[PDB]
């Protein structure tokens, strides 16, 4: 039912179901399956639809290629809904910044609007995005 970490939170949701399989193909389970602090901006299945098949066929074809972008969806510590201010930048795993902003009750990350912030896991927090994130 999603009782676990940022990994299991996705494992137990129908909208993140195919996401799990990508993370799986990436084999970075231990990253998000271990305890710590993380902020995972989780792209839904229609978000997988918002990317050119070429770039994605690269990710699903190569684990570290997939992991490359997938790690950028994950912040280095927990930035919950109550921490979302005007614009707060949080670090990520890929190495760049998550551009989180709150404008008129609408949360945005990396210039992409969030659908539902603050789905907590045991090792961090998850935020539903309907688009995938790229630098």
Q: Decide which structural class fits the backbone.
A: alpha+beta
Query: From the alpha-carbon coordinates, what is the Rg to the nearest angstrom?
Result: 13 Å
What coarse outline follows from CA principal-axis ratios? globular
- The CA-CA distance between the termini, in Å, is 32 Å
- What is the CATH-assigned architecture? Roll
Helix and strand pattern? HHHEHHEEEEEE
Query: What is the number of E strands?
Result: 7
The proportion of residues in beta strands is: 25-35%
Number of domains: 1
CATH topology: FAS1 domain
Domain FAS1: 3-133
Organism: Homo sapiens
Function: Plays a role in cell adhesion. May play a role in cell-collagen interactions.
Subunit structure: Binds to type I, II, and IV collagens.
Structural notes for this entry:
The PDB classes it as unknown function. The entry lists the keywords unknown function. With 135 residues, this protein is of the alpha+beta class. It has a single domain, classed as FAS1 domain, CATH 2.30.180. Helix content is 27%, strand content 29%. It has 5 helices and 7 strands. It has helices spanning 6-11, 17-26, 29-33, 53-59, 63-70; strands at residues 38-43, 74-75, 87-91, 97-103, 106-109, 112-120, 124-129. The protein has a 7-stranded mixed beta sheet. Helix 2 (17-26) packs across helix 5. The radius of gyration is 13 Å and the shape is globular.
